[model samples]
Target chain A: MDTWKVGPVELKSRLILGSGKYEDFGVMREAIAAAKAEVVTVSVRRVEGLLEALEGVRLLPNTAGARTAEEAVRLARLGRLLTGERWVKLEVIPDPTYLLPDPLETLKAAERLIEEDFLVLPYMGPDLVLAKRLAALGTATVMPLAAPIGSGWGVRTRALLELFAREKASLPPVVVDAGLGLPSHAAEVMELGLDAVLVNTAIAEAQDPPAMAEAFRLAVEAGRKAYLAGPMRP
Target chain B: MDTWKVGPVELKSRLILGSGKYEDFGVMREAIAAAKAEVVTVSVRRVGLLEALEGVRLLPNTAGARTAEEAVRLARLGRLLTGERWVKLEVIPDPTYLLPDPLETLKAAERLIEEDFLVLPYMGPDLVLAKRLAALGTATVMPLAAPIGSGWGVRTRALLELFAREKASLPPVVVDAGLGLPSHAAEVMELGLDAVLVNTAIAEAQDPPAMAEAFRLAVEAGRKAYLAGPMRP
Candidate 1:
């Protein structure tokens, strides 16, 4: 499969897994392991104890519940310090209803993080204009929502995805994240020639999360291969 | 009845009743007349041309299927042509599922209609964003319950109604969409909502004509009770 380099890290898998919504932490860990994703994205929640005692995993801390720019920046810095990873998934969604990112807060946080020498991967709206603005702000990758986070709505932004793919020459590599319902949706996004896809709900909510994770892993690989090999023209 | 201004149009009633999930257009009309709402909101789909024509009241065209800027622009143009001053809003988060855009859509509609145009913004659970859009010149504001086009959910009314009411500068506050049942509409109306708008619960029923009428009555009953005042804290 084709790979993309984000700062110093080389990701072999085009699929990035968002960590949350499992009934328990064990299920989440197993799902991540099953996916064999090169980058495992986890959010920072106050556990009342040290997180270092947790098992074998590379953490990509997320700013999940931040409402403002200051909170997001502070969380990003704290997460980087705690997890010891320069990579952070900058999610500044204050509202839990739709889970859409706050662009102003996200951009503010991103500007601060980038200046501090952290590799910031921002989750944002799928609009081309917003994507362009984020790219200009030095985001490592623009993680656009296919749907709202955890909605299982699948890839509803085909035209926007196509637009993003077509304009890849000028922008950062587009990572189609959030709202993937099934493996087919992930494969479809991969086939669109998007640089990567970040998934959570489908794998996490499955009857068997680990098995579903493997299914997603293979689906992403197949899709990426098809993307690189070139799709059959109608 | 207090008269409110939605852009250039003046509505005698603060209530803007939505025509959804009623037994038929007869009931919808009855509900509109009963609610005494001068402004009524309706959605236009190609399949439901006959049903849409049933309502003789002033219709504000809703951009239900719009997602991107182009579709919204088209809906705006269509609303203008339909001779409606206000737009009953619907913008999905993405197409695969029918989640409302709590942020981007309101922002888009607000930006487009800010200058001399009345926009009744419909969105999900983002009161701060809703207030911001209201300040940006939205005509009336409506926030959904669980999802749009879904008939069974409660408006996050408890969390937001007070905030919306306390904003002295905000326009007539209405729960424009998402009523699974008449009770949901009643519940929202009881929250002191200026109005409630619905479509799916009435439009896609066994007897759409009858359901539409039932919704109209339900909205009137709810509005009367709202004006009469409910037991307060």
Candidate 2:
């Protein structure tokens, strides 16, 4: 029953979708609807035909291509200018194969973005100390990976995610962001008591994009309900 | 729909519910109906409730007893009463977490099988144990993702996956115990397990019927996703 609040905007849908790797923009548009996400993420690098397809929805510009704190900050400013929004899913990664975020670098970017009046949502590995540090610096949401960027190998760093769900519940809500192959992966994260999940690869590459998105939608809701219903302790 | 097979019989449902934790047999029956589980688990301690589950493939579990002797005793009696060969062997040596002893579990399986029982041993997520159990000709190796009644979902993810991958020909590993919700069952099914055994997560829920139905939906959805082919990376 809790609304996933992004800055001043409140939304019911917890599954925030990414607008990349689809067969076409038309497919992406249909998926966004089927997913029923209040917000859709767009990379700052994609300059054309991306936002045009993202009509009638709140846009979350991410520094997808930024590899450093400065690069992320600079492009984040550009993202604000282009989308006219202060919210950003901050991703600063140097590891090309896994595309994991540099936690120290991500921390630096999140701090700078905060002072610049941006609601910074940094995607990083499931590190509790860094998450606490980010929480202290007023990061909007702490997004962690279930696995590497495109592996689709559900929650490799689970204990930390569980620790965060129990310890860092008060601070910026946790959103599991990457490497989720199936709706069940996202649902598992929610059962661990996280707020939301951001998914891209699973929906984009599915045989039926819209149906996959709908599945993700139902999955997130089911997970939230289960979390709220209270799981027996293991 | 891929039917879950146990020797000669095939079942439409992947979820197998434990009837131990429900408020009563009546509520358990409702949950069994909602889950649509063809295989249902009833601990041998609660023999009084066995008659209510006549239509389903009854899987009698031994929960409380610690030694292989007690477990075998309980299971043999269950087989006698139910007239069903199926047995879910649970030997909890460490009561603190209600954790299963791998050695003791194997011992129970061996003894139970000697009596011509279709053995399904509830165990920890250990790949070696899976191989040994399969070598013993057990019907299936039921691995726990977390401590029994804990509701923790897949604490040992890689180990179970390893068990599946390393011993692909082993009697199907049905993820059992500590699976708290529908999503947990779904994930285990997606991870290439044959079926799931659930109990407390559904019966102790705020709404048992809806939770039961939700679990059924998740199991089918997860299995369907797996069959649809791997979601692109």
Candidate 3:
């Protein structure tokens, strides 16, 4: 049995969940439990009962509010202070409209955070050079976006994502974050042999969050297992 | 709880398996079992042990036909041999590329439907031709994802998306032919199509049963995901 590593954490489940935009914390809790996520990400915020709801899981706090390298670095520290967990999903989102990550700022923030001993999972656009740099910088994982945050458009960066996964030896583990609309989308990426994926809106805004969570769980497992099982080529 | 139908028969599994190009009939049986396919298609040439495949409905296909009359005759022969009126009508004129002839297919559908045959015409992704077939009261309109046995999945994306858009006016639309991978099956099913029929991708695989199961899971996952509401374009 193989376990996926997110920094020092050996995670049994490859699906990481986000605790945001759910109908409520209660629904989020059920969805998380249904997904059986070993790691759940959260923004550094004072959400009522969110922590208690996410009690049993390992929290990977994210710097969602920060728009610059310095701001992200500060927010990373705040997440550590709030959750007391060294794990951080560093996001430097300068463009508030589309919420795309600032690649340069993300790199800068990732470097500083890695220096500070935080397990940095920095989210950025799918650029090969940036990924190589981040991987070279010893970040825990290179988190890349498939599309804009909460867009539900899965793996819009298919060619680059495939390239990143193919160049897995030299690169840090690829964990696809955001824009995953469906379980099939999640499955498609997992089948490409990416380490893990983080999903939020797809589950949170689903007609039935818990059912959708279970669906994603099955899809991820199926794709991963299928990849290992030697699927036919197209 | 969603189930797709082929003519009058209601089927639970949306994934249909083709009974050609397998290593052996032994492996074919295993693949069929793994896919959990209710409808197993067999060519009119060799019915083989297809009748013995209990708990499964066989849809005989006109695989070798190059003309409308030939296809209709093949359909009759298939129904006579298998006692199954449901037919996967294929009028492929080009032997090399294996692309279906739209004119021939339309003629076959007209003839077969008149004879009260459950016509599941395998045609090109031509929306106009598809409507004409639908107008002739075909059971299902099965458009190709690619050339037969090409393992090329969904090359006709724009046309298929058009089919999805007009799905309400059409009969159950099933994407058939050239579906090589499980992801391809999932991709088409996600397009809001009713079902898909696959052969070469599974039979030519290293492990037929494993590949078959993979397609099965993908079909269910894709169908479920579609119903649950996918990301809007």
Candidate 4:
């Protein structure tokens, strides 16, 4: 299949992974290895000195708990130094119930990050207009949730993702992030021709992370390749 | 707002950063210092003879570009020798673009590492899948991003941040990666992420030392600001 381009880099696969909720670091690492994912997500936190043992895997930091753009930007800077890489996943959520991205805060941070010359990937709602707006701002990509993050609802935004895929060609890659519960959901997103889909809980919490990771790998590949190859009629 | 759990880890942030692509190594160091990030991502690659001077930040060797699970397992065993909290971020995306596998390589690596090791896999698309698998497995947390190895487009930030917020309850934090630029890194950091991982652009550039320095500053500043708190709307 032809490779897709994002900024200055090119990607062969459209599957992205979120890092969290594993029994141990080894399981998480193995899951990623098995999935064969290229981009992995992480979060940043204060070094309480209590968890220094796990600090090694904390190479990439995130501001998942930040409520404002200023806070998010601050964490991004810190993460750059610690791991020596400037890439980040921009997420700003204030509500604890739904864990939804604060649209205003997310946009504010996205704008600032863009100005700072960082590749801003804003996790947003399925609002196509919002997605388009982000794209116009020279943002790197727009991640629209398939369902509420970690709800296990599985591709609730299927129609929206499909719309984005069909209508917008100039927009940055449309990656389906959040709320995936099964490999089938990932397959569905890939089938829709979305650039990629990010998974976490489904793989981490599965009965067997390695096996599940492999399942997702095949599901995503089948979906993506099917998208490229064009699926047959039902 | 209440804190969320990622397995046993309690995280207050959702944004994550990768430690690569700076103007200089000192700048990179400063970036991390200023960011106050808890975690910083690194990679293992062969340093050509011409790039030998760029090995200053080489604290411990990573499994240098291992493509298969067995290769990664071997690397993990070797890494344990250093005793510097050996954790592997398995990113085995063949085909030059460096896109991560959602199944074959990452899954295998995670399973092996879970047996008797600390591992962090560099993953791509399929956040939910990672979460489900991670919840039961010995893995730590899942990593998701907008693009794999691309520094230009920010397509998945909104969903990723949202996922981080939702996954907070899972007790696992999500880190973003394959970000093309520094602003991308800052966006995730500001979101109060747990950690992030990165490679490429910084190490493979014309001037690796300088780029590394810039990245350091970016990460440090971002992390510190996350801890200090930011102005909310």
Per-residue CA lDDT of candidate 2, range A153-229, in tens? 77778877888888856668788888788989888888778889999988888887777787677678778767776
**lDDT tens string, model 1, A1-234?**
346878677778777876666777777777777777767777677866224323455678888888877888888888998888998888888887898888788888898889988888988888788888878888888888898777877688777888888888778878988877665566667767788888877777766777667656655664554455343222
Docking class for model 3 is acceptable
Candidate 1 residues lying further than 4 Å off, grouped into runs, are: A48-56, B1-233
For each model in turn, which proportion of the native inter-chain contacts is also found? 0.00, 0.34, 0.33, 0.00
lDDT of 1 at B56: 43
When 3 and 4 are scored with DockQ, the better candidate is 3
For B1-233, candidate 4 gives per-residue lDDT tens digits of 43444334444433223454454555555434433334444544433311322322222223344456544555565455444333545545464655566665455555555555444455564566557546535335545455455544236677666655765544244454454433344445545665555454343444443333334433433444354343221
Each candidate's TM vs. the true structure? 0.49, 0.71, 0.90, 0.48
lDDT of 4 by residue, A1-234 (tens): 567766666777666777777778777777677777766767778666313323333233456888789999887777667666555678888885887887778888888887877777788888788888888888777889888877877777777887888855867988788887666566667657788878887777766776567656656654554454333221
Docking class of 1: incorrect
Best-to-worst DockQ order: 3, 2, 4, 1
Q: Higher DockQ: candidate 2 or 4?
A: 2
Cα error of candidate 3 at position A88, Å: 1.8
- Give the least accurate 10-residue stretch of model 4 chain B, judged by summed lDDT: B49-58
Please give the RMSD to the true structure for each candidate, in Å.
Answer: 19.5, 5.3, 2.7, 20.1
